[PDB]
Ligand binder design. Structure first.
Ligand code: HEM
Length: 152
């Protein structure tokens, strides 16, 4: 897992996200949808968005971005002791939303990209390393739940 120092880095970086959750959430989803169009198809409520301009102007997309990052933030603050918070998320995304683990890899990468884009020069090598480890832990624990369900 992560060391105490690494978790402190993760939560310090997260402070940046919390200053503008909607903005970060919106950019993460737009990065995901524009870089991997197949992901948009998983959202019946966002498949009407044919352009990035429409995505940017969508208040409902910003709303979902807030829901997504608020959930992730709650998980991150548990510093790995997130079974109760993560299990239900893993099961809903596998059985209900049908989200391949590959898409979770895509959104993890999108988060790192957005952090650099919104905070250039202020997301250090150590910070990136820590956030990456936290996102991999998140993804890997979801993957374990996916295997349990036999979900691909
Ligand atoms: C940072 C990783 C993610 C987090 C924390 C997250 C969190 C959530 C939460 C809290 C909800 C609402 C509750 C629920 O249905 O469980 C939700 C809904 C949903 N998520 Fe995710 N999600 C993540 C990644 C993804 C990815 C990668 C996809 C597909 C590309 C996806 C697709 C969906 C869909 C389709 C819904 C239902 C939306 C609706 O129509 O209301 N999620 N997600």
């Amino acid at each position: 897992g992560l060391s105490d120092g690494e978790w402190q880095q993760v939560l310090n970086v997260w402070g940046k996200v919390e200053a503008d959750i909607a903005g970060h959430g919106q950019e993460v989803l737009i990065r995901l949808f524009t870089g991997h169009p197949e992901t948009l198809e998983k959202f019946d409520k966002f498949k009407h968005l044919k352009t990035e301009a429409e995505m940017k102007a969508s208040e409902d997309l910003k709303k979902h971005g807030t829901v997504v990052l608020t959930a992730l933030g709650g998980i991150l603050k548990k510093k790995g002791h997130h079974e109760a918070e993560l299990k239900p998320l893993a099961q809903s995304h596998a059985t209900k939303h049908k989200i391949p683990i590959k898409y979770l890899e895509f959104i993890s990468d999108a988060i790192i990209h957005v952090l650099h884009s919104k905070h250039p020069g202020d997301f250090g090598a150590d910070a990136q390393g820590a956030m990456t480890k936290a996102l991999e832990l998140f993804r890997n624990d979801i993957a374990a739940k996916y295997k349990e369900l036999g979900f691909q």
